[PDB]
């Protein structure tokens, strides 16, 4: 499984989308912590 970043990628014949399962708690810190320099009081 690789991370393709760049142009608009099209899946080849033998590729399927891989679901990255983040550890619990981390998913809250990415949605909540959009900018921790300004969002810091809570």
């Amino acid at each position: 499984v690789r991370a393709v970043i760049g142009s608009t990628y099209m899946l080849t014949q033998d590729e399927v989308l891989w679901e990255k399962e983040l550890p619990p708690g981390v998913e809250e810190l990415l949605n909540k912590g959009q900018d921790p320099l300004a969002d810091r009081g809570e």
Binding site: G25, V26, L29, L30, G33, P36, L37
Partner: protein
Amino acid sequence: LSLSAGRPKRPHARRALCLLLGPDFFTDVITIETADHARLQLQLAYNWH
């Protein structure tokens, strides 16, 4: 980073992916005792970077 937050500085709060390196400051109340057994709570700004 399971950091510390709040006034009395609870040890497990403000969990967070980032770690600021800028000149910030955390205010903590500390209740200390003097040499005359007159305990008093006081605050420090703690300017850190």
